[PDB]
Design a protein around this nucleic acid. Structure first.
Ligand SMILES: Cc1cn([C@H]2C[C@H](O)[C@@H](COP(=O)(O)OP(=O)(O)OP(=O)(O)O)O2)c(=O)[nH]c1=O
Ligand SMILES: Cc1cn([C@H]2C[C@H](O)[C@@H](COP(=O)(O)OP(=O)(O)OP(=O)(O)O)O2)c(=O)[nH]c1=O
Ligand SMILES: Cc1cn([C@H]2C[C@H](O)[C@@H](COP(=O)(O)OP(=O)(O)OP(=O)(O)O)O2)c(=O)[nH]c1=O
Ligand SMILES: Cc1cn([C@H]2C[C@H](O)[C@@H](COP(=O)(O)OP(=O)(O)OP(=O)(O)O)O2)c(=O)[nH]c1=O
Ligand SMILES: [Mg+2]
Ligand SMILES: [Mg+2]
Ligand SMILES: [Mg+2]
Ligand SMILES: [Mg+2]
Lengths: 276, 17, 271, 241, 274, 271
DNA sequence: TTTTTTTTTTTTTTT
């Protein structure tokens, strides 16, 4: 059976409300003030327009979670290969932009600074990446959780697993993927960040031109906002660097709305907090 | 389906009648 | 044969007619739909995060304590420990899960076991720890527990149009046969023009996902609307969309939320 | 002419009432009052007419559909007034006045029961409220019901639902019903003889004023808006206005 | 297959010493905020109907073929093979070949046609295509067996002729073909009709959500370049380059101005100041 | 069909060793250079502004005066009426406006004097009234050996966007790599505000109704404009809207319309 | 080895 009575459940509740909770974000204060960080067993969705910074933010959140907090991070980065996304974290830690400079790459090859920068970051087994059917992908994510023991797992660009699969109705495939991913995150008890896109508006401005994004702008289905626990949206106007955060849904607490403001650093690559 | 220009020698007179 | 003449039916009508379970908050509901009844299916509709589960958890708490009836929760969306902590926090007027300074306070003060048997001391609340399996488990509740109210949290994840028609016919047959008060939460569809349901747009009876049997096989539909990114996200509007057993529908009342306590309590608002 | 309709007297002025061998469709949205209309139609064709009426309410039980008839004849809303349900228990005086004959024959495979209601019970009107649990499996059912009504020659009323509209308002907010708006298949309008629709703004300014629409009529031909009925929430009788 | 990022120490090194962008031609404001064209890079090019997509991309192909030594593979689907080959021969020699019968009759008699053919096609850097699943196979054979460094597609709307899932799957397959191969992939697309106001051919500025067919054209593209000129205005030969999206650097906006030469067919870097 | 650049040593040589000239207005040929092998020309105007009259004049001047095989596919009228239109336009009269002029040509035997001068050299071919038409145009081009194929009134032929897009794609793919001048007559959408198309509104390139793929696959676009309610109802204007070969768009010239012979003549109107 | 109904989501146009 599975009909658990609420009287014979005292020890489970006692060991549940004693243990987890925490794991704050980075770059803005209002996100941690509203959502109270990221918890095990949740789903955090992060959205933006096209080229608006929905991956720089997430890698900047993964660097601090894998370095300043010691959590094992598993990055299923499907946009770029593992030769670029593991090298973009080197300069992000060392406060430069290594891929966007042919001079600095030759400099760190010559003098031997590349070994120091590789050992200062990857001195511990904390980053376990992935390079590239939705059946083997969840198998590799379950191997990252069970075998490798990753505490935070990031699924970037979910649009190329619902469009790279041969399915007649795309909506039901997105629905099945979302409920199976939520079941994985709830069963294994892992923080799971999901990155997706937005749809075209019918009339008016575009999301890359300062349009405030609503909750119904999520592209593909309606299970994206109905089976997620926290929805975070990033909106700027290409002041093309002032980006604002908008908590569209918080399930744990109730407070939603504009969290704050962040400013991008073109020289180092960090998302600093703003004042406005 | 395609009618040549030779086939209308008397059909145009048939249409004018 | 299964035909019954209307003359030879005096005894069965005599023993049949020889209000029901009231609602908590927005007292224009039980003035309008006359409360829940045995052998009915109730639908709770809103957008994402608008408070459907919170609108039904108060109902389970007030029907398991002040009424004494056996209540069976089926949270398919979450775990049993989270909804149990939610219930213990909601009865004790202190928001439990969303405060970490008190989750460790009551475990060392010793009053956690005082709060436990004060509301879970009887055999009232029965939980479900996660198609035919769910129906068999609810029938096992009804049979071996005598549950008066059965609450179901998510109808959409049962689906892995006809599979929802069959499911709703089977749940309506279960509720009509066993006479249990069945409450089902469902979601809304994506509107194609105008505002969204999360920004204060009123809910129609068409705007329901899955199929059209959600509105054709249930006895009442209650919608809750609130403007999430608005001037205040606390004032909710409660709308009766259908009622077989009375007939009158429309806007019933208004409630606030009271973020410190978490009780949907009715407030005065003319318009 | 045939049997006359009670309420919205522009029906039998338009389609001249019901006739034998027909299949009558009563189609509306949820809560528009389909069962409330057909219950009045069943009451007025077994008391003032005297013909045997066979009800088949697959949607509810055999006790509530009789309590509503006893309350409807006695001008008192019975199932909603909790005090008068125990005040009258003169229950037998209300019971034997309207069920004293052998008129009605309720119902707790289906076509054999309808044939037993026609032959073995002598029913002149046969009412079916729920067909959705009863394309090709709907086409075969509708051909079998039309052959039953053709061979036996009985007046037949069948109730089904409407389709979910993809653009615009809902039928519950007063959207007029077209003949295409029917679930299941297309045989609902090809093998019947008349279709009656009720349209009322349920979440509106007044929800007690229905609009009656004729959608098909093989005999008289005239379709369109028939009339308006008020509901009279005190009594529950659909009366024209 | 999952990897641990400490085993990558020998491959992160190798990619550190490999990657170099290919410089554009005709405008120097494009190369300042794109830094070229790298391996595994889908570059979308768009404008209005008749504003200069094919001329720009053909000039880019010519300058990447005859000036930088890179082997180039074309897949022009609007015109045949001989039309675009004559376009390349007439454009390299700074004349207008197909739009003049007198020059075509002149160069076929005095024997200078072979002098114009050899100086282009001696080193065999150009490879052409003769006209959705066999197209990717032919492009894979063009990349692997032949060895071209840049692959150009043209007029993607023929390939998709529900179109939205078709163009999403096509864009997904082209982005997956560009990645993990090391090829620059130029893709040319069109624009939808505007709702109200004026037309794209009348000088209206193009937004990023005007790419017709889906939204997946801008969600899988690294760099998106748009061209805009007014054919009915005072100067109908001054095109404006607008970088709509750049994933590598992130600098978008007006790149620069180019002036079209009606006599030599060269869109050249202009000096117009708005 | 992966072809290297060394394989085109002799194909380019053969391809190097001609624009078919538009009659009635010399302003078109100065900014278009005629029409080549694989040339899609689109002709449009308002409702009743004279598309088919101009295209009929073009076909009559290319058929019997320049020696090119012209294949008509007029879908407005049948074969008999468009043959009557060609014979009446070539013999400088107005045929179908008077019964006496139609009757007089047979009472003296000069009706056989008009068929032999037109349809004796077999330069014309007609069609009698979507994927079945292209298989007929392929036999008209490859089998009969024609050069200019004309199609009329696309509105009966063609969600009316995917069908017209696939039709335009198939016609462009048929025109490519075959060597035929394909002329297509289309219409314009209804104007929203301002003056109508029957009063002389300047047409834009995005007025081609049905889709936006009618200007993305055409090689040349020609529009006609006439103010039939103004002071001069017998004056038309020709506007090049798109030219892929040269790139010169705008007003080509002016032509005077006549109500006596049916011809429309080159004029010298000034603005 | 094939024709009809139901329903949620992304685009391009129409009086
Ligand atoms: C966050 C941010 C990034 N940038 C720059 C830095 C990045 O290299 C570039 C965007 O890189 P990405 O953040 O990777 O772009 P994206 O993930 O939002 O879009 P998509 O995956 O759909 O292609 O823009 C800004 O200019 N301003 C900003 O605020
Ligand atoms: C009703 C209501 C809820 N809330 C907050 C408090 C709850 O902790 C939080 C959770 O809302 P839920 O009750 O969980 O909302 P939901 O079940 O309808 O949405 P879904 O299941 O699809 O995610 O909502 C308010 O802040 N104000 C309100 O008026
Ligand atoms: C006709 C009508 C009904 N009603 C109310 C009173 C009745 O108690 C209530 C029940 O109507 P029903 O007859 O039960 O409606 P229905 O059978 O068409 O819906 P479904 O079978 O899908 O559930 O309708 C009005 O309020 N005003 C009216 O005009
Ligand atoms: C760039 C440019 C070209 N032209 C001329 C030269 C070209 O041969 C002609 C257009 O030819 P293309 O450049 O090939 O036209 P297109 O690709 O933009 O449009 P489509 O393929 O959809 O038809 O216009 C100008 O007049 N002004 C200009 O600025
Ligand atoms: Mg990204
Ligand atoms: Mg919920
Ligand atoms: Mg009913
Ligand atoms: Mg082109």
């Amino acid at each position: 059976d599975g009909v658990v009575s609420a009287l014979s459940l005292r020890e489970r509740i006692r060991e549940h409300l004693s243990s987890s909770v925490g794991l704050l974000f980075s770059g803005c204060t209002g996100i941690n003030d509203k959502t109270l960080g990221a918890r095990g067993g949740e789903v955090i969705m992060v959205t933006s327009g096209s080229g608006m910074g929905k991956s720089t933010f997430v890698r900047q959140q993964a660097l601090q979670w894998g370095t300043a907090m010691g959590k094992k991070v598993g990055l299923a980065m499907l946009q770029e290969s593992v030769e670029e996304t593991a090298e973009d974290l080197i300069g992000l830690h060392n406060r430069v932009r290594l891929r966007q400079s042919d001079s600095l790459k030759r400099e760190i090859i010559e003098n031997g600074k590349f070994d120091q920068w590789f050992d200062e970051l990857f001195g511990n087994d904390t980053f376990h990446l992935y390079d590239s059917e939705t059946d083997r992908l969840l198998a590799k994510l379950a191997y990252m959780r069970s075998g490798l023991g990753c505490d935070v797992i990031i699924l970037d660009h979910i649009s190329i697993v619902v469009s790279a699969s041969g399915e007649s109705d795309e909506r039901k495939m997105i629905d099945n993927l979302m409920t199976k991913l939520k079941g994985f995150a709830k069963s294994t008890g892992v923080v799971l960040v999901v990155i997706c896109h937005l749809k075209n508006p019918d009339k008016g401005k575009a999301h890359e031109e300062g349009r405030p994004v609503s909750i119904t702008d999520l592209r593909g289905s309606g299970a994206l906002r109905q089976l997620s626990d926290t929805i975070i949206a990033l909106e700027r106007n290409q002041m093309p660097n002032l980006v604002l955060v908008r908590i569209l849904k918080c399930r744990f607490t109730g407070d939603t709305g504009i969290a704050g403001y962040m400013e991008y650093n073109k020289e180092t690559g960090w998302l600093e907090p703003s004042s406005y | 389906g395609v009618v040549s220009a030779l086939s209308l020698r008397e059909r145009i007179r048939e249409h004018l009648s």
